[PDB]
């Protein structure tokens, strides 16, 4: 669901951690470095919102 391009294992692990944390009804903070593409991980999570809720 990401039209920009492919994602790496770090971005996939971050998005999978955000979705896995969101499945339990809890919130968390992202301490990852600024050069890790946190914005691409956030928009990629908005594309990971496909659960439709």
């Amino acid at each position: 669901t990401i039209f920009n391009g492919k994602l790496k294992g770090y971005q996939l692990k971050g998005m999978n951690w955000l979705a896995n944390l969101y499945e339990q009804g809890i919130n968390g903070i992202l301490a990852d470095e600024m050069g890790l593409g946190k914005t691409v991980q956030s928009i990629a999570l908005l594309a990971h919102l496909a659960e439709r809720e």
């Binding site: 971050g14 951690w17 968390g28 903070i29 992202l30 301490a31 470095e33 050069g35």
Partner: peptide, 11 residues
């Protein structure tokens, strides 16, 4: 468990 710590040494 509520935070994600990543280091640039792996990258």
């Amino acid at each position: 468990p509520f935070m994600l710590r990543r280091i640039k040494k792996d990258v």
